[PDB]
Amino acid sequence: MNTVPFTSAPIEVTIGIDQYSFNVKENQPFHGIKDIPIGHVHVIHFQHADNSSMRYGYWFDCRMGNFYIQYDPKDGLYKMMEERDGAKFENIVHNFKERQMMVSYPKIDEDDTWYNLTEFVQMDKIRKIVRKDENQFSYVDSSMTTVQENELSDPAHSLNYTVINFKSREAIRPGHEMEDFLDKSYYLNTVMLQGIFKNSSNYFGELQFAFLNAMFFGNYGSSLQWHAMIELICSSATVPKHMLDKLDEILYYQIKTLPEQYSDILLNERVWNICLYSSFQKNSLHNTEKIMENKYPELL
Template sequence: MSRPPKTTIALDIPAGWLVGIDLYYFTSTPTFKGIKSIPPGRTHILHWGQDETSVRNGVVFEAKEGEVLIFKWDSKKEEMLTNQTIDIAEALSIVPEQYPYMLAFDTISEEHHTAESADFATLTNHVTQSVVSSVIAPDVVVSSTTATAQEAGVLKGALQKSKEQRDKRHASPVAESDVSSSTKKDASHDIPADEMNNITPGFENLDKEPTLNFPALTPDHTWRPGSTGRERTLDSLDSSWYIENVLLKDSSSSSLLGYLQLSFLLCLVLSNYSSSITWRDYIKILCKGEELSSKNPDLYVQFFDILVHQLTVAPAEYLDGLLELSALMEPLGNLKEIIFEGQRGFNNEEDAVNPRLKRGFDKLEGELEKMGYKLQKPEED
């Protein structure tokens, strides 16, 4: 069959569910079969959940000409089947009969338009397919509970340590030949079944769970390897070396901003807490970029603009909920001091205040003040 124009999403989902694309939300009907005519060339997020209180799931994708994405809810497994888990040929064969019952993207945007939804393109202007594919594998469904690879690694390490401790605790100091089979059998009754199998309850499928592969961030450890004394202190106060030589080593400023935007998007749409941590970590690191803000003001002007747009669309309950905005008042206060007072003299002579940075930060601070937030001065060491 010839494929429909633009991007088409065939979505087989129960009626009455809360479905959305980008920042548009609507309730599925018995006749709803998907979304059609999604303009190519932009990043979108398709998301769904049983209602407003349930765990939300979603897929981030780039719309392409002639692209057909298939999603089918499996009620027995209680999971969404995607292009990689269903028979594509069979699914495509029924698209023509479903097509008339799909909602056009333009229709959705007109009928469910809000002030916030209009900002979606600006919220994702750095979220390229390259950024998305480096964080999320193709067709992988992300949910409110999906962890970052960094968090999953910490958890796996803790579980491995727990396993080793259990093994050590249950290891018998007595030689195997000295213990009768009946004694071993009786002793095994004292060991929980999960410990006998070296499996921690609730984490049997941990390795199979998808993760968000954002770059690993260490906002409290921004010094260069092997540094000591004064050099480590300077790198702790000024994250410029870390940003340039770690975060931008195999990436670009635009990609860095793309990760910042993607982490916010997953937090905003899916209520993904792990992404909110990543979002805050990026902000904390950028807020210490003293030398970099002078060398690359364009990056920081864009950074301020992104934050303003993000704060504009964030629900009020998210500010000190998922986003934990209060925790950023001191880092942002530190950045204000850098911009308005110039370099502190640790690495360079003092620089004059950059007017573009000043205007951008003034706008950001004004937005924060409208929301009732006040920047804090950094604590003196």
């Protein structure tokens, strides 16, 4: 179990830790979060009480270093930092725990939700999507755009997701125009899986990370990326059986976890109806279609 201590909480803020969130009042005696499960990536995120504009946050893995949060009054946000002096850090943490100024990451023991939403997400891959190589953790916010968005403007603050574009030369082989546009298997299996991602786990990991940035930061480009990666699988006639079964599980938990009230802006009606009812894989997402129909029958 690991700990992300806070220097202080000078401004009122809603703090998220994975799928949990809690309110901290201005200058309340809050010194961080403890009992964080080792073995998963985590995201700690912020919405200031005064300006609900700009959700923002940090992806991190506690196995990769000792991290803490410190409000910056010049830039005006809670920043993640790394403490290199391990003894300084253990001593700081121990003192804050003895004075019980830390909230406890509140995992129910039956609950595999976070694992199921991050099964394929690795920090090393996050740091290639989010380029800032002097830190071991990665900052994301609501307004960051994607590489493909900037093509259609600051490349350093971008999300470098894999560009997917169904009407592109990459996606369409000369002489197979109709075949490849109507059955995307070539583009999924040869171009993307074998060529770019190397395996399905890296593919699912980008997909999961895209969903998580869409849901926690309302990042619109991430939501385009999640839907694009789903649609590419659903629109391929030929998909390994193991990917389909895993895809159904992944989407199941994503749909389960989405706040009900955010479904109107995070769920693309065209992509879902196509994926569940028209596509080659319309019969292969049983869990996902059952939860979608019982929870959001409106969209369909």
